[PDB]
Amino acid sequence: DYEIQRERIELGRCIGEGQFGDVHQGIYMSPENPAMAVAIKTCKNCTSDSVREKFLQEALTMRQFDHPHIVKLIGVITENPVWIIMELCTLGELRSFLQVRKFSLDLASLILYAYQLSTALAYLESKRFVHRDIAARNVLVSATDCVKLGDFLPIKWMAPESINFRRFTSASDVWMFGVCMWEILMHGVKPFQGVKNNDVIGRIENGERLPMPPNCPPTLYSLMTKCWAYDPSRRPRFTELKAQLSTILEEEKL
Amino acid sequence: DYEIQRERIELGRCIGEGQFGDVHQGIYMSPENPAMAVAIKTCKNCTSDSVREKFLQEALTMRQFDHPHIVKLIGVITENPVWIIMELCTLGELRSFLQVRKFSLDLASLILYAYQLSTALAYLESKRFVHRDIAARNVLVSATDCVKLGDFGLSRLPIKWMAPESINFRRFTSASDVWMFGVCMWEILMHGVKPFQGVKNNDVIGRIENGERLPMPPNCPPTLYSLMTKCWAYDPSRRPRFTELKAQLSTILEEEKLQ
Numbered sequence: 465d466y467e468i469q470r471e472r473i474e475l476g477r478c479i480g481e482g483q484f485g486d487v488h489q490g491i492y493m494s495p496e497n498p499a500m501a502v503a504i505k506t507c508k509n510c511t512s513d514s515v516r517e518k519f520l521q522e523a524l525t526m527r528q529f530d531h532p533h534i535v536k537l538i539g540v541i542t543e544n545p546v547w548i549i550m551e552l553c554t555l556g557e558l559r560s561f562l563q564v565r566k567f568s569l570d571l572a573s574l575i576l577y578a579y580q581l582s583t584a585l586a587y588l589e590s591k592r593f594v595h596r597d598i599a600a601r602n603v604l605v606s607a608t609d610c611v612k613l614g615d616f617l618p619i620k621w622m623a624p625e626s627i628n629f630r631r632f633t634s635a636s637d638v639w640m641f642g643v644c645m646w647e648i649l650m651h652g653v654k655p656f657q658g659v660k661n662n663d664v665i666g667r668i669e670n671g672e673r674l675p676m677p678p679n680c681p682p683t684l685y686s687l688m689t690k691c692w693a694y695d696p697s698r699r700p701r702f703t704e705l706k707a708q709l710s711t712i713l714e715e716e717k718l
Numbered sequence: 719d720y721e722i723q724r725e726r727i728e729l730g731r732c733i734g735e736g737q738f739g740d741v742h743q744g745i746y747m748s749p750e751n752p753a754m755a756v757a758i759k760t761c762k763n764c765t766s767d768s769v770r771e772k773f774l775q776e777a778l779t780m781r782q783f784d785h786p787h788i789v790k791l792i793g794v795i796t797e798n799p800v801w802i803i804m805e806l807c808t809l810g811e812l813r814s815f816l817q818v819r820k821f822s823l824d825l826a827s828l829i830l831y832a833y834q835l836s837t838a839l840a841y842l843e844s845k846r847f848v849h850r851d852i853a854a855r856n857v858l859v860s861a862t863d864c865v866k867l868g869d870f871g872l873s874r875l876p877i878k879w880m881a882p883e884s885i886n887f888r889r890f891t892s893a894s895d896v897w898m899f900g901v902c903m904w905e906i907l908m909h910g911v912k913p914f915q916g917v918k919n920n921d922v923i924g925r926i927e928n929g930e931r932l933p934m935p936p937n938c939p940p941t942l943y944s945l946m947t948k949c950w951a952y953d954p955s956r957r958p959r960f961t962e963l964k965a966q967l968s969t970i971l972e973e974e975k976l977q
């Protein structure tokens with residue numbers, strides 16, 4: 465059972481914008497458990513059941529999952545105003561965190577974030593779940609050494625087959641994670657900046673790729689470029705990525 | 719008419735101060751309605767008949783407008799203590815918002831704000847109403863994707879925002895509103911930095927008359943900066959109207975959403 469009652473949720477400051485409406489922080493006063501910081505996803509346009517089905521469906525998707533690097537669903541209030549209650553990652557969105565802390569972060573913290581995301585995506589691939597939107601913008605920071613995937617067309621992240629044929633598989637999630645890994649190494653800079661979405665598939669199809677970020681280890685960039693094989697069958701799986709990222713990370717810390 | 723039963727208002731945290739006194743947020747449970755979050759203007763010296771007339775007249779000014787990006791009058795309490803009850807913009811003032819979320823707002827959101835404000839100003843122009851106090855300071859945030867012109871009385875010399883003809887000749891028209899709007903767009907894209915910071919006001923008219931303009935903010939689209947410079951034509955008859963501004967802003971926005 466996931467129904468929380470409005471009275472155990474204490475609405476706080478707005479912390480950002482979500483796909484459906486403003487996200488707030490708050491406090492969930494469980495009768496059983498010590499009060500906890502929460503993020504409260506709110507919905508505007510939730511009046512029409514049509515969008516409600518889309519808003520509440522993310523909750524039902526996320527209650528499937530239990531992983532230390534996937535934001536945890538705490539519960540839902542399904543009477544209007546409809547809220548989704550999630551755990552709070554207190555250090556905010558990853559893109560902002562990377563931009564604001566650009567000169568206080570060391571390379572191996574960046575590789576660690578990429579490693580932890582690979583453990584969430586290997587977990588997802590083990591459930592045969594395809595996420596479809598792996599990007600730094602869908603990651604939150606729970607601690608300076610702990611990141612969590614959230615958010616259950618972004619042309620500049622998408623695999624060729626996704627743009628061309630709307631095909632979304634474990635291999636196209638691998639493509640996007642490659643882009644995300646690049647974003648982290650670029651301290652939150654978006655891929656293909658100053659390029660129109662319209663010219664993305666054409667340059668991708670002609671073999672253009674994101675360059676190697678400054679100070680990105682050459683072996684880590686080789687990992688990104690394997691994620692960007694045009695042929696989806698030539699791309700690694702997330703267990704391979706996770707293993708290699710552990711090696712690049714252990715070495716980086718020495 | 720706009721009278722509201724004080725038993726229906728619970729006063730809340732203070733959110734600022736106007737020339738008549740503290741502004742609070744609060745709760746209003748209207749008959750045939752549920753709870754409502756509201757902003758409450760209070761008047762310190764309402765006992766003076768003249769002050770009360772000026773104060774209440776600020777509510778009449780807002781009563782005449784009905785627009786999604788202008789704060790709405792909810793009602794007035796005319797017995798002492800005299801209050802004005804406004805719609806609440808829960809995220810507060812734009813400049814603070816812009817400063818705090820600087821590394822979180824997409825440029826698309828920055829342009830959306832400018833577009834939404836041009837929509838309110840086009841509406842005001844459609845009523846032949848001249849605002850005269852257009853500034854990021856006077857823009858409120860209802861949501862991360864919705865800003866509103868704040869209370870016109872709370873909006874209030876603002877030399878660094880004013881058109882030259884308003885400085886030199888106290889002329890205020892829709893064209894001078896368009897000048898101030900360009901400054902407000904520059905504030906937005908500068909994340910709440912004030913224009914002409916560290917410059918004396920007497921120096922500002924000299925630079926403007928000399929042809930100096932505010933610089934293109936970092937990461938601002940040239941097309942958008944060029945829109946700003948059109949609003950800062952020294953000659954008021956060369957400034958676009960808000961309908962043009964709004965239409966060009968919707969193109970600029972669509973260009974950002976196509977990256």
Ligand SMILES: CCC(=O)NCCn1cc(CNCc2ccc(Nc3ncc(Cl)c(Nc4ccccc4C(=O)NC)n3)cc2)nn1
Binds near residue numbers: 551
């Ligand atoms: C320091 C220098 C400096 O300049 N600081 C700037 C001043 N500042 C700091 C802050 C911090 N607040 C931002 C924040 C954002 C998220 C969380 N945690 C959080 N936790 C769980 C969720 Cl589910 C969530 N969701 C989301 C919330 C918003 C947007 C997207 C999602 C989402 O779901 N994305 C996939 N957010 C906690 C805080 N604000 N202004």
Ligand SMILES: CCC(=O)NCCn1cc(CNCc2ccc(Nc3ncc(Cl)c(Nc4ccccc4C(=O)NC)n3)cc2)nn1
Binds near residue numbers: 734743811858
């Ligand atoms: C003295 C020492 C000291 O520490 N003081 C601290 C006092 N403090 C608190 C804050 C935080 N502000 C939060 C805020 C601001 C606005 C709204 N929402 C809101 N909604 C509707 C209206 Cl109509 C409105 N009106 C206005 C209200 C205030 C100012 C201008 C207008 C206006 O209409 N302008 C054109 N404001 C909601 C929250 N900053 N300072």
